[PDB]
Amino acid sequence: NYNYKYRYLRHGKLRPFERDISNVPFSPDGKPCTPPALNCYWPLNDYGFYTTTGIGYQPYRVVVLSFELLNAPATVCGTDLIKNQCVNFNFN
């Protein structure tokens, strides 16, 4: 099952949530070569996920849930019935 790959070739790390995509051929000195050239390789290659892989190479789907902090008010999820009394509040 080789329909999932990765990049090990890039001119540096990533900025916050810069989603690198690029299908531009890598070479470590600029220089867009033409594969199978010398030291101008392919950045994206396989994983090698088999079910016959044991614990070691299990494919894990990872969900990252960015819980942003009150740039706008309450959207994610957060009947008190009191009349004729002085109590504390919060509404929607």
Binding site: Y8, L9, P28, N39, Y41, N45, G48, Y50, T52
Partner: peptide, 28 residues
Amino acid sequence: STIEEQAKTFLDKFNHEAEDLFYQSSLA
């Protein structure tokens, strides 16, 4: 640049290509 950085890139390519193929050969 120098030859040893692109040698690191070459060995990265060669290992992450070669492990899967030798795994297929050894499974066969």
